[PDB]
Design a protein around this ligand. Sequence first.
Ligand SMILES: C[C@@H]1O[C@@H](O)[C@H](O)[C@H](O)[C@H]1O
Ligand SMILES: C[C@@H]1O[C@@H](O)[C@H](O)[C@H](O)[C@H]1O
Ligand SMILES: C[C@@H]1O[C@@H](O)[C@H](O)[C@H](O)[C@H]1O
Ligand SMILES: C[C@@H]1O[C@@H](O)[C@H](O)[C@H](O)[C@H]1O
Ligand SMILES: C[C@@H]1O[C@@H](O)[C@H](O)[C@H](O)[C@H]1O
Ligand SMILES: [Ca+2]
Ligand code: NA
Ligand code: NA
Ligand code: NA
Length: 1029
Amino acid sequence: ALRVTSPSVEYVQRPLGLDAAHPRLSWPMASAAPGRRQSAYQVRVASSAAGLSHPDVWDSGKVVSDDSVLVPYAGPPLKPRTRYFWSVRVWDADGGASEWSAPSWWETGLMGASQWSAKWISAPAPLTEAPSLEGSSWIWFPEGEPANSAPAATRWFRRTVDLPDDITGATLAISADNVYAVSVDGAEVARTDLEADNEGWRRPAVIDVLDHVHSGNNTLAVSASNASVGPAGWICVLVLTTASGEKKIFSDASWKSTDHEPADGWREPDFDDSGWPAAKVAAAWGAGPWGRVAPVASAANQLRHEFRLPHKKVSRARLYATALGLYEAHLNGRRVGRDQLAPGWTDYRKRVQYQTYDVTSSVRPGANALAAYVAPGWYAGNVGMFGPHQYGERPALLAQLEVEYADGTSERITSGPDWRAASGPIVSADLLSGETYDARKETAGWTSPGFDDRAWLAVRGADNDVPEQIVAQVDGPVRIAKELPARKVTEPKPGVFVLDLGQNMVGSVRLRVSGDAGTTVRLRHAEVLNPDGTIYTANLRSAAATDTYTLKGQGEETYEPRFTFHGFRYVEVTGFPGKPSTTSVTGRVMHTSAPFTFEFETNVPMLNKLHSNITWGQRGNFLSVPTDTPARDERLGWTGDINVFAPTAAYTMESARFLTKWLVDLRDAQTSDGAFTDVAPAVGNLGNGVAGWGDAGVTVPWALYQAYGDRQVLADALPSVHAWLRYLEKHSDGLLRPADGYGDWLNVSDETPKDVIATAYFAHSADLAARMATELGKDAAPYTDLFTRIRKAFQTAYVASDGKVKGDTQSAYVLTLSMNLVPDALRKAAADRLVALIEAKDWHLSTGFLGTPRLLPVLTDTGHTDVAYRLLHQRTFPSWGYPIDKGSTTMWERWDSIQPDGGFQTPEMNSFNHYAYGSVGEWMYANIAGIAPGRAGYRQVVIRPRPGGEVTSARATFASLHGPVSTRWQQRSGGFVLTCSVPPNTTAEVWIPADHPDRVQHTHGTFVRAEDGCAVFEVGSGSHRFTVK
Ligand SMILES: C[C@@H]1O[C@@H](O)[C@H](O)[C@H](O)[C@H]1O
Ligand SMILES: C[C@@H]1O[C@@H](O)[C@H](O)[C@H](O)[C@H]1O
Ligand SMILES: C[C@@H]1O[C@@H](O)[C@H](O)[C@H](O)[C@H]1O
Ligand SMILES: C[C@@H]1O[C@@H](O)[C@H](O)[C@H](O)[C@H]1O
Ligand SMILES: C[C@@H]1O[C@@H](O)[C@H](O)[C@H](O)[C@H]1O
Ligand SMILES: [Ca+2]
Ligand code: NA
Ligand code: NA
Ligand code: NA
């Protein structure tokens, strides 16, 4: 009979902390018998599993309907903090009922900010702010008015200061317009370089100088240089921490200065500077051209609170938490959950996502401790090419622990003013720069009760802007999905070890190391190597991606970063005591917690590698937001890249929750006049209203609808889509769009006119809007009319009588054919011209970001699958095979990220992990695996494998919302066999290539017609076989 397998709610089994008013239920079904359909369903919801026999929440009754996917709960209003148990049964076409599904559950969260009583808290100023320059002065040589203008020259400065006894700490914060070199008692402690200066004065350095300072007289010496005629000055504070208190030494007129290069020895204590004039104050801090310059601190501080709970039986405990920043929570000596980088990146002004954890087994009678690390993340740390403090200056925590007891009583413990804070071991934590950890600074026992925190500091109430909304997390939290042990160790320079993980991955490592306390190991991360085996990092640009660990000297130490991530295949290890082995470093692969949903294997090793690389490029860039690259100083939610890649993404991973979440980010960023931004979340003032980029607001909801049959994503998008079309029509002339935007980004010397691109995308968005309106049962006429008018304008402007398209590029034909812009009479001619251009490039593509995803599909649509296969199997540059032969394990940003001569493309922009060119995937899955949606969400599957090129054998399984869709085919000794599995409540259209269609043997289904050299069959669910001999 028919049975329900793996029922889900909002795409997952047993969601915890789900705030949806009408959660959507799904019931994949299984049957060993073919041809099964659902005629009806009945859902029950109750407050207990046992209670489902007499349900107290909802009973839908028997509902006549074949709906089995994303069916919205339609009972009484759901309440916060409540677990709802549910079961479904179905009736088949003959009216026989299934068993009730094994009871499952979902649990609501807080359902809005009003249910929180917690307060936002931060570590206090001594722990969050770097030593400040306030109270100090910018100084220079006494010449003119240096804050206005000084010569392009070097000046020299000296100060001898009598330091206090019992110094326990010493820090120097220093900045110069334009550069400096500073020494203590003749030893250089810091410098900046002219040839690297880009307004370096804005970014003071903070240096630990305890190793060079002592009590009594210390001689400080500074050289500073001005880069050109204009303002000059340098500023510092030396902060000495003592047993007594704090002592500060400033840059000021007590310093001596000279404008003539001094004799050598000028940095030494006993040098004679009695003839030097006093330095001149150029401006007090905050004055001059420089403003309120401050060094940046990025500690991940420890926050904790101990509390007593009653000695009663616990029924349930939940922790609800979030941060402006990142956090990791601990309760009674045990880490809470397995999420990384919680709560993820949203526009924190508009929303922050919160997490719900089951901590029933962790709570104790009597004494308890709740604790957290709180780090800068995207909220306060470096973001893209834009520096830190994008949303706020320092991170904040919100936490609410609810304990329910068997007697019906409860306790609530919250973040608030009674919590205490300490620096702990995470000295610095930045997504881009890396994490710095000193194991000697650990505070053993801090996450457990009975801990001595008298010398910890009171927390402050956070001064952060309050998010408008606190929302249950929509996407799968980032979690470690796999470990990659190092596969070999090399030593390309003495004491510099490089460990190869064998795959370009995203996450961070586990380091295992034994040695003396105070030994510091440095870990740098790279996507590629230099020809000499050293790591190449120039393409990372300003992202250091460096983690630093200082040992505590206790056995085989383990270091795992928490508040950073990197994109890398190779790890360079320096400062290691002895020689690392393969066990010393292990990659921890991190991404959204969503299943992989497409298994694909052919007889062709190169295609199998291509598929692997696609899935690695996807997972590497699916951490909180869909990123362009996970490695360099960017990692932004680029609309264009996800536009092109979304249809492929939705084959290979369950991408519904992930891209649903992202589309909320995109709509949060849409401008008041309706323009979608180039990136979302919107940071760095990058721009908006770009064809092929902003259009992701239309194309991504449509891609999700096609793959999943998710109608809610269309309903949620259509208003923003309307506003986008209004914006586009306003910014056009006779419906032709300007030649602006990124265009067919990174094409191979075949640049498509940007007005052709822009007008084409405008038409396509109108087309998709009409399709959305139609699916939702709304009036589609206005959108259809708009599409008609744009297509007419497009054809008149850009399409010639012989079918040539303006620009005559591969992408010009690909886009116009794909988007149905070529007049029907001229499709043949346009496609012939495309093939001619490919032939003229010696059977190579020339397409960039926008052309590539549509290239092979258009070729197949126009009767040139053989050409598609020629391009697919191509191994020389440019092609998919070319990087694979060079050892790629992901998709590269450029067709020539490594050039034919072996050199790298320009580090100004050159990533080895962009998913855009992995858009070939959808062609393979639809045409080699033969798995494509005939109706949205695979309610009907079109099974049309097209054997060709080198492919004689293929097998695939797609995990659709209805259950598995599988194919297996083989050409052997003239014959062809295809087997497939089609899940209950769906149907298939199967195309079997044959010289004689009516001769095709088949266990199930009905021959309906011969078309395009195939027997076409319509078949219901089941395990089918087709044979041609
Ligand atoms: C304040 C001023 O800012 C920039 O124009 C340069 O960094 C210059 O050298 C500096 O003097
Ligand atoms: C304070 C002290 O005085 C003298 O011994 C010299 O001037 C010496 O260099 C200085 O550091
Ligand atoms: C390459 C492939 O990718 C995903 O399906 C899983 O991580 C699987 O374990 C791995 O082998
Ligand atoms: C136009 C934009 O340019 C690069 O800087 C991004 O990494 C992204 O791939 C692309 O869409
Ligand atoms: C998040 C942040 O918000 C504002 O300060 C600006 O829009 C800026 O460009 C962006 O980076
Ligand atoms: Ca200057
Ligand atoms: Na959850
Ligand atoms: Na449905
Ligand atoms: Na002297």
